[PDB]
Design an enzyme around this catalytic site. Sequence first.
Site, PDB file in Angstrom:
ATOM      1  N   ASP A  62      31.533  45.413  77.393  1.00 16.76           N
ATOM      2  CA  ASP A  62      32.284  45.008  76.199  1.00 16.76           C
ATOM      3  C   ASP A  62      32.748  46.209  75.334  1.00 16.76           C
ATOM      4  O   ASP A  62      31.934  46.999  74.856  1.00 16.76           O
ATOM      5  CB  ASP A  62      31.539  43.927  75.395  1.00 16.76           C
ATOM      6  CG  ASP A  62      30.296  44.454  74.706  1.00 16.76           C
ATOM      7  OD1 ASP A  62      29.267  44.598  75.411  1.00 16.76           O
ATOM      8  OD2 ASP A  62      30.273  44.744  73.472  1.00 16.76           O
ATOM      9  N   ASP A  78      39.455  48.020  71.443  1.00 20.11           N
ATOM     10  CA  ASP A  78      40.350  49.129  71.127  1.00 20.11           C
ATOM     11  C   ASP A  78      40.020  50.422  71.971  1.00 20.11           C
ATOM     12  O   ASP A  78      39.957  51.539  71.456  1.00 20.11           O
ATOM     13  CB  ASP A  78      40.344  49.354  69.581  1.00 20.11           C
ATOM     14  CG  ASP A  78      40.260  48.026  68.793  1.00 20.11           C
ATOM     15  OD1 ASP A  78      41.131  47.158  68.990  1.00 20.11           O
ATOM     16  OD2 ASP A  78      39.341  47.725  67.990  1.00 20.11           O
ATOM     17  N   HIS A  90      30.691  50.499  61.606  1.00 19.97           N
ATOM     18  CA  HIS A  90      31.612  50.445  62.758  1.00 19.97           C
ATOM     19  C   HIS A  90      32.932  51.158  62.505  1.00 19.97           C
ATOM     20  O   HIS A  90      33.718  50.755  61.634  1.00 19.97           O
ATOM     21  CB  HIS A  90      31.887  48.995  63.175  1.00 19.97           C
ATOM     22  CG  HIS A  90      30.648  48.226  63.541  1.00 19.97           C
ATOM     23  ND1 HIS A  90      30.274  47.993  64.846  1.00 19.97           N
ATOM     24  CD2 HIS A  90      29.686  47.661  62.770  1.00 19.97           C
ATOM     25  CE1 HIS A  90      29.156  47.294  64.866  1.00 19.97           C
ATOM     26  NE2 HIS A  90      28.777  47.081  63.618  1.00 19.97           N
ATOM     27  N   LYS A 128      42.194  44.697  54.645  1.00 12.44           N
ATOM     28  CA  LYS A 128      42.522  45.571  53.526  1.00 12.44           C
ATOM     29  C   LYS A 128      43.120  46.845  54.063  1.00 12.44           C
ATOM     30  O   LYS A 128      42.875  47.200  55.240  1.00 12.44           O
ATOM     31  CB  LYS A 128      41.279  45.924  52.740  1.00 12.44           C
ATOM     32  CG  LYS A 128      40.593  44.694  52.150  1.00 12.44           C
ATOM     33  CD  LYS A 128      39.536  45.084  51.145  1.00 12.44           C
ATOM     34  CE  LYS A 128      38.808  43.838  50.557  1.00 12.44           C
ATOM     35  NZ  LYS A 128      39.800  43.059  49.778  1.00 12.44           N
ATOM     36  N   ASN A 137      48.743  51.021  56.822  1.00 15.33           N
ATOM     37  CA  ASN A 137      47.312  50.919  56.836  1.00 15.33           C
ATOM     38  C   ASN A 137      46.835  52.012  57.745  1.00 15.33           C
ATOM     39  O   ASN A 137      47.137  51.977  58.922  1.00 15.33           O
ATOM     40  CB  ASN A 137      46.949  49.571  57.445  1.00 15.33           C
ATOM     41  CG  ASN A 137      45.492  49.250  57.286  1.00 15.33           C
ATOM     42  OD1 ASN A 137      44.737  50.000  56.629  1.00 15.33           O
ATOM     43  ND2 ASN A 137      45.064  48.118  57.864  1.00 15.33           N
ATOM     44  N   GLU A 160      50.201  46.014  65.660  1.00 13.90           N
ATOM     45  CA  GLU A 160      49.303  47.146  65.532  1.00 13.90           C
ATOM     46  C   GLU A 160      49.206  48.018  66.743  1.00 13.90           C
ATOM     47  O   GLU A 160      49.721  47.716  67.808  1.00 13.90           O
ATOM     48  CB  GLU A 160      47.864  46.748  65.130  1.00 13.90           C
ATOM     49  CG  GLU A 160      47.314  45.381  65.534  1.00 13.90           C
ATOM     50  CD  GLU A 160      45.935  45.057  64.898  1.00 13.90           C
ATOM     51  OE1 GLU A 160      45.298  45.937  64.246  1.00 13.90           O
ATOM     52  OE2 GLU A 160      45.453  43.906  65.049  1.00 13.90           O
ATOM     53  N   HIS A 195      45.318  46.050  72.250  1.00 18.21           N
ATOM     54  CA  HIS A 195      44.969  47.384  71.768  1.00 18.21           C
ATOM     55  C   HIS A 195      44.753  48.283  72.955  1.00 18.21           C
ATOM     56  O   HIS A 195      43.652  48.716  73.234  1.00 18.21           O
ATOM     57  CB  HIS A 195      43.767  47.407  70.837  1.00 18.21           C
ATOM     58  CG  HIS A 195      43.712  48.656  70.004  1.00 18.21           C
ATOM     59  ND1 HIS A 195      43.587  48.642  68.627  1.00 18.21           N
ATOM     60  CD2 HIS A 195      43.824  49.962  70.356  1.00 18.21           C
ATOM     61  CE1 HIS A 195      43.642  49.883  68.174  1.00 18.21           C
ATOM     62  NE2 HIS A 195      43.773  50.706  69.201  1.00 18.21           N
TER      63      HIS A 195
END
Length: 315
Positions: free
Chosen positions: A4, A7, A61, A85, A124, A190, A260
């Site tokens: 697992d 990204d 993380h 955020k 961001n 993203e 990702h």
Amino acid sequence: KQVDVHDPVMTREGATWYLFSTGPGITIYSSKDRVNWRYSDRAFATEPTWAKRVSPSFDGHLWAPDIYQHKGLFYLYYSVSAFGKNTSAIGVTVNKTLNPASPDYRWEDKGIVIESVPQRDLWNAIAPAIIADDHGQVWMSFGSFWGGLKLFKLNDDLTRPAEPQEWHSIAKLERSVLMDDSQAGSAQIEAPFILRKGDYYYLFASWGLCCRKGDSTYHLVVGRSKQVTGPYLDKTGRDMNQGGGSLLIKGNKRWVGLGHNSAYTWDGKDYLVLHAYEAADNYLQKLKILNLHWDGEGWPQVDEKELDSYISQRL
Ligand SMILES: OC[C@@H]1O[C@@H](OC[C@@H]2O[C@@H](OC[C@@H]3O[C@@H](OC[C@@H]4O[C@@H](OC[C@@H]5O[C@@H](OC[C@@H]6O[C@@H](O)[C@H](O)[C@H]6O)[C@H](O)[C@H]5O)[C@H](O)[C@H]4O)[C@H](O)[C@H]3O)[C@H](O)[C@H]2O)[C@H](O)[C@H]1O
Ligand SMILES: [Cl-]
């Protein structure tokens, strides 16, 4: 069990592969064959000293690493942030080697490359990717939601933006500035990654929603440009800055959401590296490494069946 990761990125030193994932201090694994992986290390024993200043809710993380090799050193970029955020920053830490058994192995933090601030920035600072052009310059692409994905020139060190600064937008989706600047908005994009192949730079990005189990819509798109600074056009000739992006791989009933990605040229073959959510295993994301082919038109293609055939081992 499958490895697992979220990204994911990869690199190779000598005869060994190394895998970096989103996770506490950045999770690192190693393999000698890209299938069988042992836990290798966490980049940070705990967290960056500056993390809680940028994001006070920080849980330990780091997100969305990128691994880059340059003048014999290992540059590991990483993201401090909070969910939904843009109180975020991308930092980098540097090592002389990846083998934790070497007396030369130790990660030294270089601090913040770039940081976004609510209300000041419409971007961001997460999810860096490093790419070099034909002219000796190195660039970082990064971003998630808000006003989309950006590219900027790094300084000599690779630790901060070059001065004077040089920025370019590379991909975007619709957003009105009239929206509250602190909201991620509805631009679901993203996780840029740029691969050089032949005469073109290929920009991969993720569209849709990750991390939503059964509701996930995450998949990968791609565009290409003759210059690293754009404009990246999809197959129909539409600029990713106005929402272009050609479908590369999407999920199905076994794999609900994927993306990702990163991508690499190793030994004259190309690979697509991503995570995918397994519907059978609680939608827990799994590593997948797919063969990355190229059609007669200069466009990458992948075989979605490889989401099944690629089965990685956690030892
Ligand atoms: O397998 C290895 C382990 O898995 C990891 O655990 C999984 C998760 O990954 C880590 O974070 C992943 C990063 O999160 C993804 O999401 C990016 C976020 O989405 C964009 O915001 C969307 C926006 O957010 C939601 O509303 C937010 C609300 O507003 C906040 O203020 C409030 O708290 C929220 O309720 C809406 O859905 C939407 O409008 C932002 O850009 C960004 O924040 C990125 O793709 C990933 O990089 C995280 O640790 C786990 O959650 C383990 O880490 C690893 O061990
Ligand atoms: Cl990435």
